[PDB]
Structure formats: structure tokens, C-alpha cells
Amino acid sequence: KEMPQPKTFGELKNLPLLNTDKPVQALMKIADELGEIFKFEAPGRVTRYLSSQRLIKEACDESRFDKNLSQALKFSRDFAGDGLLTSWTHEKNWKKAHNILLPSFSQQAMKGYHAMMVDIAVQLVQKWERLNADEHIEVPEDMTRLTLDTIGLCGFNYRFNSFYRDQPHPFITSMVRALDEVMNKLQRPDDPAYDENKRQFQEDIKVMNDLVDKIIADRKASGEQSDDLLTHMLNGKDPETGEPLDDENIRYQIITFLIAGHETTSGLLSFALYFLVKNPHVLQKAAEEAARVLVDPVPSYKQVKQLKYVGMVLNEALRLWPTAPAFSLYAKEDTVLGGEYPLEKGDELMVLIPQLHRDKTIWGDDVEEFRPERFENPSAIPQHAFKPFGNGQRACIGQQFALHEATLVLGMMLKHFDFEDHTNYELDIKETLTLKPEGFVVKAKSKKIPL
Amino acid sequence: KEMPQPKTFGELKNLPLLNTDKPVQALMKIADELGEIFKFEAPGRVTRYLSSQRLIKEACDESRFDKNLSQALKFSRDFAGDGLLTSWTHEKNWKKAHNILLPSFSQQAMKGYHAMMVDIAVQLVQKWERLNADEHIEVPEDMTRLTLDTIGLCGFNYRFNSFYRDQPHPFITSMVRALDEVMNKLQRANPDDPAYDENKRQFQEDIKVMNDLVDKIIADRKASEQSDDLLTHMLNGKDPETGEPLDDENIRYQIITFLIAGHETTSGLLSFALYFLVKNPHVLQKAAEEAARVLVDPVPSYKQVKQLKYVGMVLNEALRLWPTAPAFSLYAKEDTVLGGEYPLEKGDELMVLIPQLHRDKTIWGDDVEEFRPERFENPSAIPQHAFKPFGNGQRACIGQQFALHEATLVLGMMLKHFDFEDHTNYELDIKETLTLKPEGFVVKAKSKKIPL
Numbered sequence: 001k002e003m004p005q006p007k008t009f010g011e012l013k014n015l016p017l018l019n020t021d022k023p024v025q026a027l028m029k030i031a032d033e034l035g036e037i038f039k040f041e042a043p044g045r046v047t048r049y050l051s052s053q054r055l056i057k058e059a060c061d062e063s064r065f066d067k068n069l070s071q072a073l074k075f076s077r078d079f080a081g082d083g084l085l086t087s088w089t090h091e092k093n094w095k096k097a098h099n100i101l102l103p104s105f106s107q108q109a110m111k112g113y114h115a116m117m118v119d120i121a122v123q124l125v126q127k128w129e130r131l132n133a134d135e136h137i138e139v140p141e142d143m144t145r146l147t148l149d150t151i152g153l154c155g156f157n158y159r160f161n162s163f164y165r166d167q168p169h170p171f172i173t174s175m176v177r178a179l180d181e182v183m184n185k186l187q188r189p190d191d192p193a194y195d196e197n198k199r200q201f202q203e204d205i206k207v208m209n210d211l212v213d214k215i216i217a218d219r220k221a222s223g224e225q226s227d228d229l230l231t232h233m234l235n236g237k238d239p240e241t242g243e244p245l246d247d248e249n250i251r252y253q254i255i256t257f258l259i260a261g262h263e264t265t266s267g268l269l270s271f272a273l274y275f276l277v278k279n280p281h282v283l284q285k286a287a288e289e290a291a292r293v294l295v296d297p298v299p300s301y302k303q304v305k306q307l308k309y310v311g312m313v314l315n316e317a318l319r320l321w322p323t324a325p326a327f328s329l330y331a332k333e334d335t336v337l338g339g340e341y342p343l344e345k346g347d348e349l350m351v352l353i354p355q356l357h358r359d360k361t362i363w364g365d366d367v368e369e370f371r372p373e374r375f376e377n378p379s380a381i382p383q384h385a386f387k388p389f390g391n392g393q394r395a396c397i398g399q400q401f402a403l404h405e406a407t408l409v410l411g412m413m414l415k416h417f418d419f420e421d422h423t424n425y426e427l428d429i430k431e432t433l434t435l436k437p438e439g440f441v442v443k444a445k446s447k448k449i450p451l
Numbered sequence: 452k453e454m455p456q457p458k459t460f461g462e463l464k465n466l467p468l469l470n471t472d473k474p475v476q477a478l479m480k481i482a483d484e485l486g487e488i489f490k491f492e493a494p495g496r497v498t499r500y501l502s503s504q505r506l507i508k509e510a511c512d513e514s515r516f517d518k519n520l521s522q523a524l525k526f527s528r529d530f531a532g533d534g535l536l537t538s539w540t541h542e543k544n545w546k547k548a549h550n551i552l553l554p555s556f557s558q559q560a561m562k563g564y565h566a567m568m569v570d571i572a573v574q575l576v577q578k579w580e581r582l583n584a585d586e587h588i589e590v591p592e593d594m595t596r597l598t599l600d601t602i603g604l605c606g607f608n609y610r611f612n613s614f615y616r617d618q619p620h621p622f623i624t625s626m627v628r629a630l631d632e633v634m635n636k637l638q639r640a641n642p643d644d645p646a647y648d649e650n651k652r653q654f655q656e657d658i659k660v661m662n663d664l665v666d667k668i669i670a671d672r673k674a675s676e677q678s679d680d681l682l683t684h685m686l687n688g689k690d691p692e693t694g695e696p697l698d699d700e701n702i703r704y705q706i707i708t709f710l711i712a713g714h715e716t717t718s719g720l721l722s723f724a725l726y727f728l729v730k731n732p733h734v735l736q737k738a739a740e741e742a743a744r745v746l747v748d749p750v751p752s753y754k755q756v757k758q759l760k761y762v763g764m765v766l767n768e769a770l771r772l773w774p775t776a777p778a779f780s781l782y783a784k785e786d787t788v789l790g791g792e793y794p795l796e797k798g799d800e801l802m803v804l805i806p807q808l809h810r811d812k813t814i815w816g817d818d819v820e821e822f823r824p825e826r827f828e829n830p831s832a833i834p835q836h837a838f839k840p841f842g843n844g845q846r847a848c849i850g851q852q853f854a855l856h857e858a859t860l861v862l863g864m865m866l867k868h869f870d871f872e873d874h875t876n877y878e879l880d881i882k883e884t885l886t887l888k889p890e891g892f893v894v895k896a897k898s899k900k901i902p903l
């Protein structure tokens with residue numbers, strides 16, 4: 001009945017616990033000490049972090065809870081607006097955009113994206129095969145190159161040409177700096193000292209809007225016919241109201257999909273490669289499957305579908321390190337959680353996804369081991385035990401896109417290269433609003449299989 | 452490219468090769484001579500028996516192959532209908548029943564089953580502790596008593612009371628005879644001779660006995676406690692897709708299905724596991740140490756059973772050497788090539804010979820015939836699709852976890868409470884119905900005098 005709560009800092013309550021460079025890993029440690037639920041207070045805010053499948057399965061009841069905007073998502077509205085990810089379920093523009101955009105992530109849409117996914121995946125393989133003796137690969141950097149280029153090409157027929165750059169594209173430099181300022185506003189008054197920080201925020205948002213303007217103007221002047229994400233954005237009509245998306249919302253969606261479309265996916269690929277080089281039994285099993293399934297120089301759509309074990313590898317990477325580590329919920333009415341924790345209408349909850357995926361009562365005692373075989377049979381996983389893509393009607397719309405891209409890329413990587421952990425890399429998880437291994441490097445020796 | 456094929460008997464082709472009391476062991480011997488794949492022809496049917504992980508890993512690709520109904524499952528349809536095991540994947544009642552009944556095998560359902568599993572397991576332990584001097588135990592018979600009562604109690608709140616009987620329950624007398632007639636329809640050189648007419652008459656009477664018990668189980672439930680067991684989901688559970696529940700014809704097929712599938716293979720597993728334990732005293736000791744330190748209470752709990760790691764490895768190593776459901780069948784969904792060597796047309800049939808697959812020397816090494824539970828410490832070291840005792844994919848065994856929990860609980864209590872003796876130096880004799888069991892397996896067990 002009485003809820004635990006971590007240590008407090010006077011009038012700041014628990015907020016200084018978040019004044020760290022790895023807050024999710026710190027929240028995981030508090031969960032280890034306090035258990036399945038604890039209260040977290042900050043100036044002007046109260047929330048509750050859930051860690052057990054038992055309580056999270058109740059919070060995922062959509063008749064009792066709706067998506068809440070975390071403080072990180074509230075601040076992100078300054079550039080993402082009422083796009084799909086940063087809008088409330090009751091805002092007209094969510095359901096409208098959800099109806100207009102779901103078709104662009106169907107199976108027939110996936111088949112159309114596949115060719116352009118291979119285009120970028122081939123650029124990755126060729127970069128690595130063009131390395132000189134004893135040169136190494138910066139894994140998370142190259143994964144971000146691939147995932148950003150893939151969403152740009154597949155979604156908008158725009159080429160970021162990340163593999164022609166040693167520095168990151170100016171879009172993500174401002175993207176990262178804007179998100180870093182969002183991060184800073186969490187652990188922060190508005191004294192004059194922050195005037196430059198507010199000025200820098202406005203410049204970085206303008207840089208992103210400038211790219212969006214180029215993407216839209218290129219399409220209007222294009223003259224060709226495309227059938228991608230941008231096409232449904234401009235021409236698709238909501239079957240309810242009959243209306244298409246108006247002009248502010250399209251640019252909010254473009255910004256939204258550019259960011260949501262690439263960051264979590266590159267982290268997933270980076271984590272997947274880390275666990276593979278750290279677990280030679282798994283890597284051999286995954287490389288055997290890639291070799292026997294990907295028999296052509298260019299993988300087909302059906303061939304990617306057949307990489308069952310690579311998909312199990314990816315799901316086991318999402319279990320240990322879900323790259324979007326949390327989502328928020330609020331109680332729609334007065335209700336009781338777990339029969340012991342009463343909640344009022346509007347009370348907020350945090351789902352701590354990494355901790356949910358370490359519930360020993362669900363996954364057994366060995367939660368920290370990397371075992372893709374946990375996912376051999378999907379029906380064996382209890383309901384709401386595995387939640388890397390959110391929940392319900394507010395779940396990740398790009399889930400199938402992300403899993404197809406990652407399976408294609410990982411499969412080609414395993415077919416064409418042998419990888420070495422030549423530095424005996426010690427896992428260092430960097431935290432923005434998502435999770436990535438920082439400094440992860442490998443050496444790859446080509447198997448000399450042509451494309 | 453060219454596929455081997457065993458000796459033929461004129462117009463009967465390979466069918467007389469199956470006219471034996473040990474056909475699976477006969478098919479294993481043919482595999483030893485012919486290798487990883489061979490063609491087997493019968494009047495009106497062609498199939499291919501697979502034996503290597505190399506080819507079976509491709510056959511388990513669900514995008515290219517679907518579950519096929521073998522002739523054994525086709526004939527079993529006369530009493531199992533379109534229940535879960537004998538229905539085609541494309542029959543509406545398979546997916547519907549799969550959606551409704553999968554929750555009754557979840558972790559929360561297992562915890563609810565656990566008390567009634569202990570109920571039957573204690574009756575077993577008490578029977579053995581009540582034996583007189585120099586009396587022995589009939590292992591497969593007592594395992595069949597336990598597994599049948601466990602599925603009866605846990606699934607349907609019906610007590611077969613097998614430990615109060617000398618002769619088998621009337622249900623399984625007709626059940627064993629019905630399954631025996633299915634086996635006979637397989638091996639018959641000519642299928643409708645006059646001699647078999649009574650055999651068909653007896654077949655129908657045995658089906659009526661089984662259906663009559665189903666009627667009693669259903670009427671007993673209709674006359675109101677409040678249960679949440681397998682039968683409860685059968686009667687009230689609704690398919691989230693179609694919104695509808697199962698109709699009354701299909702429920703009766705499911706009850707028959709789960710009564711049979713729920714116990715026969717599990718009793719064979721427990722018998723084989725106990726056989727390998729008495730034949731390998733180092734393993735038996737290692738498993739006995741674990742039972743002693745984990746089962747510290749007079750009644751084992753759900754968590755304690757979860758902790759019997761070595762006993763679970765013991766059960767998996769018994770399933771490797773003698774998988775009690777010895778085969779399953781597949782058909783090609785489209786034209787495809789197997790192993791880059793064997794072209795298959797749409798509809799072509801395959802048989803997975805599970806005991807032979809589990810003896811693939813390229814997978815398990817030099818000691819394939821040795822009983823070493825250690826082989827299962829790490830699943831990541833086992834190549835993909837090398838271990839298939841519960842079938843494959845969406846048609847894999849739905850009762851897998853229930854079977855593994857029951858057997859782990861029972862074996863653990865057996866090892867905690869008794870020391871076992873192979874007083875006859877029993878020579879393994881594998882009986883074949885549609886499943887495999889050691890016939891005539893007997894032991895002596897002397898109690899450790901630990902109260903319950």
C-alpha cells in the first residue's frame with residue numbers, strides 16, 4: 001500500500017538523481033533496490049516507475065490508461081509539434097495522421113521500400129570492404145549513417161549521403177544539439193544566463209525546418225511519381241473527416257519520422273553487433289543462417305523474411321537494451337493498481353522497459369544472459385512481458401520497417417564479414433533520449449563474396 | 452539428386468516393411484543404411500523420411516512447409532476430429548482453438564495447475580512407500596497412472612483414480628484398443644479384407660466408450676465450484692479474432708484430444724528418464740543431490756520445480772535418445788528445392804524421423820548413444836533445429852511446458868524419497884504404439900523415510 005521512494009534533495013525532491021549522464025541506468029539501479037514500483041517527485045511533477053510484468057500488464061489496459069507525454073516528449077513538441085509521437089491521443093491530429101499513415105507501413109509498403117533499403121545496405125558493405133589493413137569500424141557511427149540514409153531515401157526520396165561524409169550531416173548535428181538541450185531542460189528557472197541556450201535551440205530547430213522545406217519543395221518540383229511515406233503525407237486522406245493533413249502537420253511529421261525513423265534503429269543494430277561478438281556461439285548460429293538464406297548478391301524481400309534466427313537475435317538485443325527505454329501513461333479514471341496502489345484520475349506512470357525485461361519471475365533467473373533462443377517460440381512469451389515498441393494503439397508505427405531494415409542489414413553483415421573484438425570492448429552505454437554503446441569498435445575481415 | 456529407397460515388394464512397394472511391431476526402429480535401421488533421406492512408397496502414397504539436421508532445418512521453415520497429417524493422424528481423426536492435433540492448419544477450428552486454449556498453458560495457468568499435480572504425485576510416492584519387502588515397481592504402468600490422472604484432474608477436475616485400480620481405467624482400455632486399430636490400418640497390405648470387419652465394429656464401440664466419458668466430464672462441469680482450468684477455457688474462452696467461442700462438436704474433439712495427447716507421451720518420457728537414470732549411476736547421483744537440496748519442504752512448490760535444472764536436463768537428454776512422439780509430417784507449400792539437391796513439388800510429403808535426427812553425429816559428436824544430460828547446459832551451442840521432440844513452429848506441442856513441469860516435479864519427488872535398484876539388469880525393450888515406451892521396465896525402490 002505504501003510506495004517506496006529514493007533519496008531526496010530537500011526542495012528539489014528526487015530531481016538531482018536525474019542530474020547524471022546515464023539516468024536510465026541510474027533508474028534501473030533504484031528499481032533493483034526498491035522493487036516493482038517507486039514514487040518519483042520533482043518540482044511540479046509526480047510520477048511512478050513500474051518494473052514488473054505484473055503491474056505493467058495492468059497499465060497496458062487501454063480502457064484504464066492512455067498515453068501520457070513525458071517531460072522529454074513535452075519539450076520535444078517545440079520541433080516535433082503534434083506529430084505522431086509527441087501528440088496526445090485526444091488531439092485531432094493524432095488519429096487523423098494515424099489513419100493516413102498506417103497504410104505506408106503495411107506489408108505491400110514494405111516490399112516497395114525493400115529495394116531502397118538494399119541501396120543503403122550495399123553502401124555500408126562496400127565501405128567496410130574498402131578498409132585498409134588493420135583499420136577498424138566505428139559501429140554506432142556507421143549504424144547511424146545507415147539508418148538515417150534509409151529513412152531519408154525510403155520515406156522521402158532524399159539522400160543524406162552519410163557515407164560520403166566523415167562528419168555527421170548538418171541535420172543531425174542540430175538534431176543532437178536540440179535533443180541535448182531537451183535533456184538539459186529536464187535536470188535544470190529562465191535567468192538571462194540561458195539566453196544563448198534558447199538562441200541555440202531556435203537556430204537548431206530552424207536548421208531542421210530548412211531541411212524539411214527542401215524535402216517538400218523537391219517533391220513539388222519533382223515531376224516523377226513516388227509511392228513512399230512522403231506521398232501518403234501529401235495526398236492521403238483521412239477516411240473519417242475526408243481531409244488530408246494540413247501544412248503545419250506535414251512538416252511536424254517529416255521532422256518526427258526523420259528522428260524516430262533512425263535513432264533507435266541504429267542503437268538496436270549497434271547493440272545486436274555487440275552481443276554477437278561477445279557471444280561466439282550465437283554469432284556462428286546467426287552467420288550460418290545468413291549464409292544459407294542469402295544466396296543471391298542482393299537479398300530479396302522473401303529472403304529477409306526467412307532470417308528467423310537473426311530476428312531472434314534482434315529481439316534478444318531489444319530485451320536487454322530497448323533503445324527507447326521508457327514510455328508514459330496516465331490513469332483515465334480513478335482506479336487501483338495491482339489491488340494495492342490506488343491512483344487518482346490523471347496520475348502518471350513510467351514503464352521502465354529495461355527493468356520489465358529483467359523480471360526474473362517471467363524470464364527465469366538468468367535474465368542478464370544474451371540468449372536469442374528465448375524467442376524460438378513467440379507463443380511462449382507471456383502477454384505484456386516484452387514491450388520494446390510501446391503499447392496498444394500508441395505502439396510504434398514503424399516497428400515492421402525497423403525490424404525489416406535491421407534484419408536485412410545484420411544478415412548482409414554476417415554473410416560478408418568475420419568480425420573481431422580486437423579491443424576487448426567494455427560496454428559503455430551512452431544516454432540521450434535513447435541508448436547506444438559508445439566507442440564500440442570492431443575489425444571486419446571480408447569473406448570476399450561479391451555483390 | 453537421385454533419392455535412395457529401401458527394398459520393395461512388387462505392387463505393395465515398401466508397405467510390407469511396416470508390417471512389424473517396431474516400425475519406427477525399423478525405419479531408423481533403414482536410415483542407417485540409406486542415409487539422411489530416403490523415399491518410401493505405399494499403395495496410393497509417397498513420402499520421404501528425413502534424418503539429418505541439415506535437411507530438417509530447411510523443412511522446419513514455415514514459409515516453405517506446413518504441417519501435414521500423416522496417415523496415423525488422418526485415421527485418428529475418427530475420434531479426435533478437428534481437435535488441435537489432428538486438424539489442418541487451414542481449418543478454421545485450428546487457429547480458433549489455438550487462440551482460445553494457449554492461455555490455459557501460460558505461466559499463471561501452470562501455477563494454478565501445480566497443486567493438483569502435487570495431489571497426484573503424492574499418491575504415487577505413497578503407493579511406493581507402501582510396498583512390502585522385495586516387491587518391485589512396474590515403471591511404465593505407474594507412470595501411465597500418474598500422467599493420465601494428472602491431465603484428468605488438472606484439465607477437467609475429473610479423477611480417474613488410477614492408483615485405486617489393478618486393471619487400466621475403462622477409458623484407456625478402449626483408448627489403447629482404438630489406437631491399436633489405427634496402427635493396424637497402417638500396416639495392412641490390403642486394407643479392407645473380411646477378417647477386419649469385426650475390427651471395424653470394435654473400433655466404433657471403443658470410440659463410444661471414449662465419447663461417453665467426455666459426456667460425463669461435460670455434464671459434471673454443467674452441474675455447478677468455480678474452476679479456472681483447461682475445460683473452463685474450452686467452454687467459455689472466446690477467440691479474440693472471430694469473437695466467437697468453440698461450438699459443442701469441437702469441444703468434444705478437444706477433450707478427447709487432450710486426454711490422449713496429455714498423458715501417453717509424458718508417461719513414456721518419465722519411464723525412459725528413469726531407465727537412463729538407473730543405467731547411469733553417476734547421473735542418478737547428480738540428479739539426486741539436486742532434488743535433496745532444492746526440495747526442502749514436504750510438498751514441492753512451483754518455484755522449487757523451476758529450480759531443478761539438472762532434472763530438466765535429464766528429461767531433455769531422455770527426449771533426445773527416445774522422443775516419445777517419434778515423428779511428424781510436413782508438406783511443401785510451393786515448389787522448392789531441398790538441400791540444393793532434391794526438388795519438391797507443391798504438396799509433396801515429408802516425414803521427420805526424430806530419433807534418427809537426434810543421432811546426427813555431425814551435431815552431437817562421437818558419443819551420440821551415451822546418456823549425458825550436460826549436452827543441454829547451453830542452448831546457444833546447439834545448432835538450429837537439431838532438437839525437435841515437441842514438433843515445430845505454430846504446430847509445435849502446446850502442452851510442452853505442462854509436460855516438462857509435471858515430469859520435473861514427479862522425477863524430483865521420486866529422487867528425493869527413494870533409492871532405486873535395477874534388480875533384474877533390465878534389457879531395454881522399446882514398445883511401439885503410435886508412441887514409444889520401455890516395455891517390462893521394473894525396478895526396486897527402497898524408501899529414504901522422508902515424511903510428506
Ligand code: HEM
Binds near residue numbers: 396
Ligand atoms: C529499434 C527501433 C524502434 C524502437 C525500439 C521504437 C520504439 C518506439 C516506442 C517505445 C514508441 C512508443 C513511445 C511512447 O509510447 O511514448 C514508438 C512510437 C513511434 N515510433 Fe518507434 N521505434 C523504433 C523505430 C521506429 C521507426 C523506424 C519509425 C518510423 C520510420 C518509428 C516511428 C514511430 C512513431 C511515428 C511513433 C509514434 C506512433 C504513434 O503514437 O502514433 N519508430 N516507437
Ligand code: HEM
Binds near residue numbers: 602714775841851
Ligand atoms: C513428453 C511429452 C510430450 C511430447 C514428446 C509431445 C510431442 C508432441 C509433438 C511432436 C507434437 C507435434 C506433432 C505434429 O506436428 O504432428 C505435439 C503436438 C501437440 N501436443 Fe504434445 N507432446 C507431449 C506432451 C503433451 C501434453 C502434456 C499435452 C496436453 C496436455 C500435449 C498436447 C498436444 C497438442 C494439443 C498438440 C497439437 C498442437 C497443435 O498442432 O496446435 N502434448 N506434441
Ligand SMILES: O=C(CCCCCn1ccnc1)N[C@@H](Cc1ccccc1)C(=O)O
Binds near residue numbers: 326
Ligand atoms: O527518459 C525519459 C522519457 C523519455 C522517453 C523516450 C522518448 N522516445 C524516443 C523514441 N521513442 C520514445 N525520462 C522521464 C524522466 C523525468 C521524470 C520526472 C521529471 C523529469 C524527468 C521524462 O522525460 O519525464
Ligand SMILES: O=C(CCCCCn1ccnc1)N[C@@H](Cc1ccccc1)C(=O)O
Binds near residue numbers: 469498522885886
Ligand atoms: O510413425 C508415423 C507417424 C506417427 C506420429 C505419432 C503421432 N503423435 C502422437 C502425439 N503426437 C503425435 N508413421 C507414418 C508411416 C506410414 C508411411 C507410409 C505409409 C503408411 C504409413 C504415417 O503415419 O503415415
Ligand SMILES: Cc1ccc(N)cc1
Binds near residue numbers: 076085256263264433
Ligand atoms: C520526438 C523524438 C523522436 C525520437 C527520438 N529518439 C527523440 C525525440
Ligand SMILES: Cc1ccc(N)cc1
Binds near residue numbers: 537630886
Ligand atoms: C490423436 C492422438 C493424440 C495422441 C496420441 N499419442 C495419439 C493420437
